[PDB]
Amino acid sequence: VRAVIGSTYMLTQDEVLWEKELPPGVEELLNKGQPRNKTRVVSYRVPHNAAVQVYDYREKRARVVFGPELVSLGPEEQFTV
Amino acid sequence: PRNKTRVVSYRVPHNAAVQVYDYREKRARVVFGPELVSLGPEEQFTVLSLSAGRPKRPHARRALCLLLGPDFFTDVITIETADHARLQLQLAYNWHFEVNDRKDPQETAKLFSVPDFVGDACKAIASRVRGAVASVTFDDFHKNSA
Amino acid sequence: LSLSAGRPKRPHARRALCLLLGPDFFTDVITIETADHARLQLQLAYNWHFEVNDRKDPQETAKLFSVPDFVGDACKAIASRVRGAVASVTFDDFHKNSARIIRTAVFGPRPRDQAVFPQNGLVVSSVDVQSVEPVDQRTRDALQRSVQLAIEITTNSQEAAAKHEAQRLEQEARGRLERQKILD
Amino acid sequence: VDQRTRDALQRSVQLAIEITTNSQEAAAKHEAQRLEQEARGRLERQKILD
């Protein structure tokens, strides 16, 4: 599974859309901070003077994103609640 | 319902640890921090049974992971002063697990040795406070309790 | 194994295929009596673990299972030491020193930091007193009057201190006024 | 074995608490008298300085 980001895309013969499930509390916090199309890349607009912690459970890479930024999650990344 | 044929996996929280034992390879492992822990055919999670609530009742919470990071648990204890005044004291204790080397098998297995760290620390500290205040009068205690 | 369980520690209440070895604690509720006959219900928790020197020694290891009920033996043994020590102590001396009296009674009189049971290698490392209470309400009512009298003592001490400063300020004003009349 | 013997011991318990209550009030009385005299002795001196 991989995130295809930034350009008009045609699914090659081997590919299908994959639905990203989120913990039962996270899906509401994305709407409060704004039905979700589960196949679209999950993104959050970080406020000014705030930080978000994300963990990549596949690449095993931790990241904290500061300030106003758009944070998008990879297939196995998750937000810290 | 869980598909029993799919590999069992758990997303370990940040500042937490999980203890797994391989009952076939006979290899013990503790997994720290944010990580995905998957179980082999005969591996099993260690299940903690912990004290919970304000009066701290035993076996009230169950967990697959030991939370390690700086946190606090509240406890309500009844104590008695030297002049017999009986006081209900509400406390909160800040706690964390100190780990010197996350690669040491013996230090790391030691974290899971006590079956209920919450219940033990609350029960231990309450007895020290009760023991000290029993030798102090209520007027001296009220002005110096902190 | 057939082991003792519950807060009053009844025998044969739990059965198990495995002896838990690691650091843990069992609670016990014991009734004791002081030198002046005050009868107290004392709640205790004892931290314990089995000390094993060599996990490959057949004799040291077989020794762990020799006692049929280690919980029942250790609770019964320690309760008798606490009851035996407190029977020689008055209720006032006991109330103010209970944590030290119990620690000394259990570990001993030779000072030590732990109690070892050599029959199976069980070690008790602490006694944490949870509470102490008179068994009869008529004994609690007598202590509740002592609390009221201790608060009245504290209230009187406050008024007496206020009275002494009022007299000091009154005299300090009066002495300056008496002088000023002579200067006028 | 007999309740009539336990009641006799329960009276000794009540008297031991009253003994402790009296011992407490007597100590408060002795400190009140010490402080009262310590105030009075300083006031008597201040009147002579005034």
Short mmCIF file of C-alpha atoms in Angstrom, two decimals:
data_model
loop_
_atom_site.label_atom_id
_atom_site.label_comp_id
_atom_site.label_asym_id
_atom_site.label_seq_id
_atom_site.Cartn_x
_atom_site.Cartn_y
_atom_site.Cartn_z
CA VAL A 1 0.00 0.00 0.00
CA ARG A 2 1.28 3.55 -0.79
CA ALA A 3 -0.07 7.10 -0.77
CA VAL A 4 -0.31 8.61 -4.28
CA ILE A 5 -0.20 12.41 -3.77
CA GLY A 6 -0.23 15.56 -5.95
CA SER A 7 -1.22 14.72 -9.59
CA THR A 8 -4.15 13.31 -11.62
CA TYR A 9 -3.72 9.51 -11.38
CA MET A 10 -4.84 6.40 -13.31
CA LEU A 11 -4.77 3.10 -11.35
CA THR A 12 -2.46 0.66 -13.25
CA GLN A 13 -3.73 -2.93 -13.90
CA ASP A 14 -2.33 -4.34 -10.61
CA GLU A 15 -3.78 -1.56 -8.36
CA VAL A 16 -6.98 -0.97 -6.33
CA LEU A 17 -8.09 1.82 -3.92
CA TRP A 18 -7.30 1.02 -0.24
CA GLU A 19 -9.54 2.19 2.67
CA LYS A 20 -7.65 3.71 5.66
CA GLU A 21 -9.37 2.92 8.97
CA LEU A 22 -8.82 5.43 11.83
CA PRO A 23 -9.22 4.84 15.62
CA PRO A 24 -12.85 5.55 16.73
CA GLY A 25 -11.90 8.90 18.35
CA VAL A 26 -9.71 10.34 15.51
CA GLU A 27 -12.33 10.53 12.73
CA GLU A 28 -14.45 12.97 14.80
CA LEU A 29 -11.45 15.18 15.75
CA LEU A 30 -10.63 15.64 12.04
CA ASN A 31 -14.25 16.85 11.41
CA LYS A 32 -14.28 19.06 14.59
CA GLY A 33 -10.94 20.64 13.51
CA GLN A 34 -12.12 20.95 9.83
CA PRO A 35 -19.10 10.70 5.40
CA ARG A 36 -15.28 10.53 4.91
CA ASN A 37 -14.12 8.81 1.70
CA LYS A 38 -11.78 6.23 3.35
CA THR A 39 -9.59 5.91 0.21
CA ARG A 40 -8.54 9.62 0.20
CA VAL A 41 -5.29 10.57 1.99
CA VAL A 42 -6.06 11.73 5.55
CA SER A 43 -4.90 15.34 6.08
CA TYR A 44 -5.07 17.75 9.03
CA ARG A 45 -4.48 21.54 8.94
CA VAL A 46 -2.28 22.23 11.98
CA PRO A 47 -3.14 25.60 13.65
CA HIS A 48 -0.63 28.44 14.18
CA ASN A 49 1.42 27.94 17.43
CA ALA A 50 0.51 24.22 17.73
CA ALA A 51 2.23 20.83 17.21
CA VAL A 52 1.10 17.35 16.06
CA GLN A 53 2.83 14.03 16.77
CA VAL A 54 2.62 11.30 14.12
CA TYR A 55 4.18 7.83 14.16
CA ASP A 56 4.86 5.71 11.09
CA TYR A 57 4.09 2.15 12.22
CA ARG A 58 5.68 0.75 8.94
CA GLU A 59 8.80 2.88 8.34
CA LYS A 60 9.28 3.06 12.17
CA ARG A 61 9.90 6.86 11.88
CA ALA A 62 8.51 9.31 14.50
CA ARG A 63 7.74 12.96 13.55
CA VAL A 64 6.39 16.06 15.26
CA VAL A 65 5.06 18.82 12.99
CA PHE A 66 5.08 22.39 14.35
CA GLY A 67 3.29 25.59 13.32
CA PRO A 68 0.79 26.11 10.49
CA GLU A 69 1.27 23.13 8.15
CA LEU A 70 -0.80 20.49 6.32
CA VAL A 71 -0.03 17.08 7.86
CA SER A 72 -0.93 14.09 5.66
CA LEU A 73 -0.79 10.48 6.93
CA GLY A 74 0.88 7.58 5.08
CA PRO A 75 -1.01 4.22 4.92
CA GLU A 76 0.14 3.08 8.40
CA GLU A 77 0.81 6.49 10.05
CA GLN A 78 -1.39 7.52 13.03
CA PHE A 79 -2.05 10.76 14.98
CA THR A 80 -1.27 10.89 18.73
CA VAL A 81 -4.57 11.79 20.52
CA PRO B 1 -15.43 -10.55 14.90
CA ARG B 2 -11.64 -11.13 14.61
CA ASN B 3 -10.48 -13.33 11.71
CA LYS B 4 -8.49 -15.88 13.79
CA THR B 5 -6.16 -16.72 10.84
CA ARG B 6 -4.73 -13.17 10.51
CA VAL B 7 -1.51 -12.36 12.42
CA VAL B 8 -2.40 -10.76 15.76
CA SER B 9 -0.91 -7.24 15.97
CA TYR B 10 -1.02 -4.47 18.61
CA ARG B 11 -0.05 -0.78 18.14
CA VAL B 12 2.05 -0.01 21.22
CA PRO B 13 1.42 3.56 22.55
CA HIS B 14 4.12 6.24 22.94
CA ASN B 15 5.95 5.97 26.34
CA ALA B 16 4.65 2.41 26.98
CA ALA B 17 6.06 -1.15 26.92
CA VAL B 18 4.63 -4.63 26.08
CA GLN B 19 5.97 -8.01 27.26
CA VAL B 20 5.65 -10.99 24.90
CA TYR B 21 6.86 -14.56 25.42
CA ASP B 22 7.52 -17.06 22.64
CA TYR B 23 6.31 -20.37 24.10
CA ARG B 24 7.96 -22.28 21.14
CA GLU B 25 11.29 -20.51 20.51
CA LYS B 26 11.54 -19.89 24.31
CA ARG B 27 12.61 -16.24 23.64
CA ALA B 28 11.30 -13.45 25.90
CA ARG B 29 10.96 -9.88 24.52
CA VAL B 30 9.84 -6.49 25.80
CA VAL B 31 8.89 -3.91 23.17
CA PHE B 32 9.20 -0.23 24.17
CA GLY B 33 7.81 2.97 22.65
CA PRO B 34 5.57 3.36 19.60
CA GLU B 35 5.91 0.12 17.61
CA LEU B 36 3.66 -2.48 15.95
CA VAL B 37 3.96 -5.76 17.91
CA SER B 38 2.92 -8.91 16.00
CA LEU B 39 2.60 -12.35 17.66
CA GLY B 40 4.11 -15.57 16.24
CA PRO B 41 1.90 -18.73 16.29
CA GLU B 42 2.74 -19.57 19.94
CA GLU B 43 3.63 -16.06 21.26
CA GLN B 44 1.36 -14.47 23.94
CA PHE B 45 0.93 -11.00 25.50
CA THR B 46 1.51 -10.49 29.25
CA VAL B 47 -1.76 -9.08 30.72
CA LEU B 48 -1.42 -6.59 33.60
CA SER B 49 -4.22 -6.29 36.22
CA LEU B 50 -4.01 -2.83 37.88
CA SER B 51 -5.72 -0.89 40.71
CA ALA B 52 -8.12 1.97 39.72
CA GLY B 53 -10.64 4.57 41.01
CA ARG B 54 -10.04 7.31 43.67
CA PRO B 55 -10.03 4.89 46.71
CA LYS B 56 -7.75 2.57 44.53
CA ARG B 57 -9.58 -0.81 44.37
CA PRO B 58 -7.48 -3.78 43.07
CA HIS B 59 -8.05 -5.59 39.71
CA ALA B 60 -10.18 -2.69 38.35
CA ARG B 61 -8.20 -2.14 35.05
CA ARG B 62 -6.53 -4.59 32.57
CA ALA B 63 -3.87 -3.74 29.99
CA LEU B 64 -1.48 -5.38 27.49
CA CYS B 65 1.03 -2.51 27.91
CA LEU B 66 2.75 -0.97 30.95
CA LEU B 67 2.60 2.86 30.66
CA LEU B 68 6.14 4.10 31.47
CA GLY B 69 6.18 7.88 30.97
CA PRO B 70 5.69 10.66 33.52
CA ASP B 71 2.10 10.52 34.76
CA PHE B 72 0.16 10.73 38.07
CA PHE B 73 -2.39 8.63 39.98
CA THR B 74 -4.75 10.09 42.62
CA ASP B 75 -5.43 8.30 45.94
CA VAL B 76 -7.82 9.10 48.85
CA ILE B 77 -6.49 7.92 52.22
CA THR B 78 -7.90 8.14 55.75
CA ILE B 79 -5.35 8.94 58.47
CA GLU B 80 -5.44 9.72 62.20
CA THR B 81 -3.46 12.36 64.19
CA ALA B 82 -1.80 12.06 67.64
CA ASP B 83 -4.88 13.71 69.29
CA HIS B 84 -7.20 11.23 67.43
CA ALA B 85 -8.56 13.70 64.83
CA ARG B 86 -9.46 11.51 61.82
CA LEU B 87 -8.69 13.14 58.47
CA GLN B 88 -9.52 12.16 54.87
CA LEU B 89 -6.45 13.18 52.84
CA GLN B 90 -6.50 13.42 48.99
CA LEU B 91 -3.12 12.89 47.29
CA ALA B 92 -1.70 12.69 43.77
CA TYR B 93 1.74 11.11 43.20
CA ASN B 94 3.84 11.84 40.09
CA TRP B 95 5.59 8.68 38.86
CA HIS B 96 7.67 7.22 36.00
CA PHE B 97 9.71 4.06 35.30
CA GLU B 98 13.47 4.60 35.16
CA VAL B 99 15.09 2.39 32.46
CA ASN B 100 18.92 2.58 32.12
CA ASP B 101 19.29 0.42 28.97
CA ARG B 102 16.35 -0.59 26.72
CA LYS B 103 18.53 -3.47 25.30
CA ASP B 104 19.26 -5.13 28.71
CA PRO B 105 16.99 -8.24 28.99
CA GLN B 106 17.16 -8.42 32.82
CA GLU B 107 16.51 -4.71 33.59
CA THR B 108 13.70 -4.67 31.05
CA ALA B 109 12.02 -7.89 32.29
CA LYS B 110 12.13 -6.32 35.82
CA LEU B 111 9.46 -3.70 34.82
CA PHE B 112 6.77 -6.43 34.57
CA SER B 113 7.86 -8.33 37.74
CA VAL B 114 5.41 -6.55 40.10
CA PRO B 115 1.85 -7.60 39.04
CA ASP B 116 0.22 -4.27 40.15
CA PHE B 117 2.63 -1.31 40.40
CA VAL B 118 -0.26 1.16 40.95
CA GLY B 119 -1.72 -0.81 43.85
CA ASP B 120 1.74 -1.43 45.40
CA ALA B 121 2.96 2.22 45.22
CA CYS B 122 -0.37 3.64 46.55
CA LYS B 123 -0.49 1.02 49.41
CA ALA B 124 3.20 1.66 50.24
CA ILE B 125 3.06 5.50 50.28
CA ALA B 126 -0.26 5.60 52.19
CA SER B 127 1.32 3.60 55.05
CA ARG B 128 4.31 6.05 55.29
CA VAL B 129 1.96 9.07 55.45
CA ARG B 130 -0.38 7.35 57.97
CA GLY B 131 2.68 6.35 60.07
CA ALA B 132 4.12 9.92 60.18
CA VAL B 133 0.85 11.79 60.91
CA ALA B 134 -0.05 9.43 63.82
CA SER B 135 2.84 11.08 65.77
CA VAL B 136 1.65 14.67 64.96
CA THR B 137 -1.21 16.70 66.53
CA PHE B 138 -3.95 18.13 64.31
CA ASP B 139 -2.97 21.81 64.84
CA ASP B 140 0.71 21.12 64.02
CA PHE B 141 -0.36 18.96 61.05
CA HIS B 142 -2.82 21.51 59.54
CA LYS B 143 -0.14 24.28 59.50
CA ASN B 144 2.66 21.95 58.17
CA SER B 145 0.90 19.15 56.17
CA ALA B 146 2.68 19.92 52.86
CA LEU C 1 -1.24 -26.09 45.87
CA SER C 2 -4.14 -25.20 48.21
CA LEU C 3 -3.64 -21.63 49.52
CA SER C 4 -5.29 -19.22 51.99
CA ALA C 5 -7.34 -16.29 50.54
CA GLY C 6 -9.70 -13.38 51.41
CA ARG C 7 -9.03 -10.42 53.81
CA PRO C 8 -9.47 -12.48 57.07
CA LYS C 9 -7.25 -15.21 55.30
CA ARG C 10 -9.42 -18.38 55.35
CA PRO C 11 -7.55 -21.67 54.56
CA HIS C 12 -8.09 -23.76 51.36
CA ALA C 13 -9.83 -20.82 49.59
CA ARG C 14 -7.64 -20.86 46.38
CA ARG C 15 -6.11 -23.76 44.34
CA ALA C 16 -3.22 -23.44 41.88
CA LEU C 17 -0.88 -25.51 39.67
CA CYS C 18 1.89 -22.86 39.96
CA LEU C 19 3.62 -21.19 42.92
CA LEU C 20 3.93 -17.43 42.23
CA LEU C 21 7.55 -16.48 43.09
CA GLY C 22 7.97 -12.80 42.20
CA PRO C 23 7.56 -9.71 44.39
CA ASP C 24 3.90 -9.39 45.42
CA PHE C 25 1.82 -8.63 48.55
CA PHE C 26 -1.04 -10.24 50.53
CA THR C 27 -3.37 -8.22 52.81
CA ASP C 28 -4.42 -9.54 56.25
CA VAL C 29 -6.91 -8.22 58.87
CA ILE C 30 -5.93 -9.10 62.46
CA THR C 31 -7.51 -8.34 65.84
CA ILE C 32 -5.02 -7.50 68.61
CA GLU C 33 -5.25 -6.26 72.21
CA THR C 34 -3.10 -3.64 74.02
CA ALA C 35 -1.70 -3.72 77.61
CA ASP C 36 -4.69 -1.61 78.85
CA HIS C 37 -7.11 -4.03 77.06
CA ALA C 38 -8.05 -1.72 74.14
CA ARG C 39 -8.99 -4.16 71.35
CA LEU C 40 -7.90 -3.00 67.89
CA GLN C 41 -8.60 -4.35 64.39
CA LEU C 42 -5.34 -3.84 62.45
CA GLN C 43 -5.17 -4.05 58.61
CA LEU C 44 -1.75 -5.03 57.20
CA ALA C 45 -0.16 -5.76 53.84
CA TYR C 46 3.13 -7.72 53.68
CA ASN C 47 5.46 -7.56 50.64
CA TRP C 48 7.01 -10.98 49.90
CA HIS C 49 9.08 -12.94 47.34
CA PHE C 50 10.81 -16.36 47.16
CA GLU C 51 14.61 -16.19 47.25
CA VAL C 52 16.11 -18.86 44.92
CA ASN C 53 19.95 -19.02 44.81
CA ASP C 54 20.27 -21.55 41.95
CA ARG C 55 17.38 -22.49 39.60
CA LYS C 56 19.32 -25.69 38.63
CA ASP C 57 19.72 -27.07 42.21
CA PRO C 58 17.18 -29.95 42.64
CA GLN C 59 17.10 -29.68 46.46
CA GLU C 60 16.81 -25.86 46.80
CA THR C 61 14.13 -25.84 44.12
CA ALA C 62 12.09 -28.77 45.54
CA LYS C 63 12.14 -26.87 48.89
CA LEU C 64 9.80 -24.10 47.49
CA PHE C 65 6.85 -26.55 47.38
CA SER C 66 7.59 -28.17 50.80
CA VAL C 67 5.16 -25.94 52.77
CA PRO C 68 1.57 -26.74 51.58
CA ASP C 69 0.25 -23.17 52.24
CA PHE C 70 2.93 -20.44 52.34
CA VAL C 71 0.29 -17.65 52.42
CA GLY C 72 -1.50 -19.20 55.39
CA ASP C 73 1.80 -19.91 57.22
CA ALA C 74 3.34 -16.41 56.74
CA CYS C 75 0.11 -14.53 57.65
CA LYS C 76 -0.46 -16.76 60.76
CA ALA C 77 3.20 -16.44 61.82
CA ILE C 78 3.48 -12.63 61.42
CA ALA C 79 0.09 -11.95 63.07
CA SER C 80 1.27 -13.79 66.21
CA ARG C 81 4.47 -11.61 66.38
CA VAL C 82 2.44 -8.39 66.08
CA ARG C 83 -0.16 -9.61 68.64
CA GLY C 84 2.68 -10.66 71.00
CA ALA C 85 4.46 -7.26 70.81
CA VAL C 86 1.36 -5.02 71.11
CA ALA C 87 -0.01 -6.91 74.18
CA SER C 88 2.91 -5.36 76.17
CA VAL C 89 2.16 -1.76 74.92
CA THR C 90 -0.57 0.72 76.04
CA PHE C 91 -3.03 2.17 73.51
CA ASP C 92 -1.65 5.76 73.69
CA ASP C 93 1.97 4.59 73.20
CA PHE C 94 0.82 2.21 70.44
CA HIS C 95 -1.27 4.77 68.49
CA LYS C 96 1.62 7.31 68.28
CA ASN C 97 4.25 4.61 67.42
CA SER C 98 2.29 1.78 65.64
CA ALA C 99 4.36 1.88 62.41
CA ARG C 100 7.66 1.42 64.36
CA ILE C 101 6.24 -1.12 66.85
CA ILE C 102 4.87 -3.37 64.04
CA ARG C 103 8.13 -3.05 61.98
CA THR C 104 10.16 -4.05 65.09
CA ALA C 105 7.76 -6.88 66.07
CA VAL C 106 7.82 -8.52 62.61
CA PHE C 107 11.51 -8.22 61.60
CA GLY C 108 13.00 -8.25 65.14
CA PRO C 109 14.62 -8.20 68.99
CA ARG C 110 17.85 -8.07 66.80
CA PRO C 111 17.26 -5.24 64.18
CA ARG C 112 16.77 -6.48 60.55
CA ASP C 113 15.23 -5.19 57.28
CA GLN C 114 13.44 -8.49 56.29
CA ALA C 115 11.88 -11.69 57.70
CA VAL C 116 13.10 -15.00 56.20
CA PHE C 117 11.15 -18.28 56.46
CA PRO C 118 13.81 -21.06 56.01
CA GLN C 119 11.28 -23.92 55.45
CA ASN C 120 10.75 -22.83 51.79
CA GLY C 121 12.90 -19.66 51.23
CA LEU C 122 9.98 -17.19 51.45
CA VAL C 123 11.11 -13.64 52.35
CA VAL C 124 8.89 -10.82 53.66
CA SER C 125 10.51 -7.38 53.08
CA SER C 126 7.97 -4.87 54.41
CA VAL C 127 4.80 -4.51 56.50
CA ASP C 128 2.61 -1.63 55.34
CA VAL C 129 -0.10 -0.78 57.93
CA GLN C 130 -3.30 0.23 56.09
CA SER C 131 -5.39 1.19 59.16
CA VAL C 132 -5.90 0.75 62.94
CA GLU C 133 -9.39 0.89 64.56
CA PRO C 134 -11.02 0.14 67.95
CA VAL C 135 -13.38 -2.88 67.65
CA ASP C 136 -16.22 -1.39 69.82
CA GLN C 137 -17.98 1.93 68.97
CA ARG C 138 -17.99 2.82 72.74
CA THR C 139 -14.16 3.06 72.44
CA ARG C 140 -14.39 5.29 69.29
CA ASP C 141 -16.87 7.66 71.03
CA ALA C 142 -14.38 8.14 73.89
CA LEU C 143 -11.67 9.10 71.34
CA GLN C 144 -14.09 11.45 69.45
CA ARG C 145 -14.44 13.49 72.72
CA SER C 146 -10.62 13.81 72.91
CA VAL C 147 -10.70 15.43 69.40
CA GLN C 148 -13.29 18.01 70.48
CA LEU C 149 -11.28 18.86 73.62
CA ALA C 150 -8.12 19.23 71.46
CA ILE C 151 -9.91 21.75 69.18
CA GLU C 152 -11.27 23.67 72.21
CA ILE C 153 -7.65 23.76 73.56
CA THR C 154 -6.52 25.24 70.19
CA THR C 155 -9.43 27.75 70.18
CA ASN C 156 -8.61 28.90 73.76
CA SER C 157 -4.91 29.26 72.84
CA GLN C 158 -5.90 31.60 69.97
CA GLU C 159 -8.16 33.81 72.15
CA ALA C 160 -5.53 33.94 74.93
CA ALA C 161 -2.89 35.09 72.38
CA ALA C 162 -5.27 37.75 70.98
CA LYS C 163 -6.00 38.98 74.56
CA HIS C 164 -2.25 39.36 75.29
CA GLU C 165 -1.60 41.45 72.13
CA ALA C 166 -4.74 43.58 72.76
CA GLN C 167 -3.39 44.38 76.28
CA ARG C 168 0.10 45.14 74.86
CA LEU C 169 -1.28 47.57 72.24
CA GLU C 170 -3.73 49.13 74.76
CA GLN C 171 -0.87 49.75 77.22
CA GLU C 172 1.43 51.02 74.40
CA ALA C 173 -1.27 53.57 73.41
CA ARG C 174 -2.04 54.49 77.06
CA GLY C 175 1.63 55.11 77.95
CA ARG C 176 2.12 57.50 74.97
CA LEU C 177 -1.11 59.37 75.78
CA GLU C 178 -0.04 59.80 79.46
CA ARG C 179 3.27 61.29 78.21
CA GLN C 180 1.59 63.58 75.67
CA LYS C 181 -0.71 65.06 78.40
CA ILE C 182 2.44 66.18 80.28
CA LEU C 183 4.00 67.68 77.11
CA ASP C 184 0.73 69.56 76.42
CA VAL D 1 -14.66 -17.44 78.41
CA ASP D 2 -17.45 -15.44 80.20
CA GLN D 3 -18.82 -12.09 78.89
CA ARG D 4 -18.99 -10.78 82.54
CA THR D 5 -15.15 -10.93 82.52
CA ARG D 6 -14.90 -9.08 79.15
CA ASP D 7 -17.16 -6.24 80.38
CA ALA D 8 -14.85 -5.71 83.39
CA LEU D 9 -11.87 -5.33 80.99
CA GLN D 10 -13.87 -3.01 78.66
CA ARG D 11 -14.33 -0.61 81.66
CA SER D 12 -10.51 -0.49 82.08
CA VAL D 13 -10.27 0.61 78.40
CA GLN D 14 -12.65 3.54 78.97
CA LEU D 15 -10.70 4.64 82.06
CA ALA D 16 -7.41 4.49 80.04
CA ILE D 17 -8.86 6.90 77.43
CA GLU D 18 -10.17 9.25 80.17
CA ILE D 19 -6.67 9.14 81.78
CA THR D 20 -5.21 10.18 78.38
CA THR D 21 -7.86 12.92 77.90
CA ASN D 22 -7.10 14.34 81.39
CA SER D 23 -3.33 14.18 80.70
CA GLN D 24 -3.91 16.23 77.51
CA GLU D 25 -5.99 18.96 79.23
CA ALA D 26 -3.49 19.19 82.11
CA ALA D 27 -0.65 19.83 79.60
CA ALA D 28 -2.72 22.56 77.84
CA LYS D 29 -3.50 24.18 81.24
CA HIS D 30 0.22 24.24 82.18
CA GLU D 31 1.21 25.92 78.87
CA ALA D 32 -1.71 28.43 79.10
CA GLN D 33 -0.47 29.40 82.61
CA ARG D 34 3.15 29.66 81.32
CA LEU D 35 2.15 31.91 78.38
CA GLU D 36 -0.26 34.00 80.53
CA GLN D 37 2.52 34.61 83.07
CA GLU D 38 5.06 35.35 80.26
CA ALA D 39 2.69 38.04 78.86
CA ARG D 40 1.86 39.42 82.35
CA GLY D 41 5.54 39.64 83.37
CA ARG D 42 6.38 41.69 80.21
CA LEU D 43 3.31 43.95 80.61
CA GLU D 44 4.24 44.68 84.27
CA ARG D 45 7.75 45.68 83.07
CA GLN D 46 6.44 47.85 80.20
CA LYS D 47 4.20 49.83 82.65
CA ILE D 48 7.36 50.80 84.62
CA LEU D 49 9.19 51.81 81.40
CA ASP D 50 6.13 53.88 80.31
#
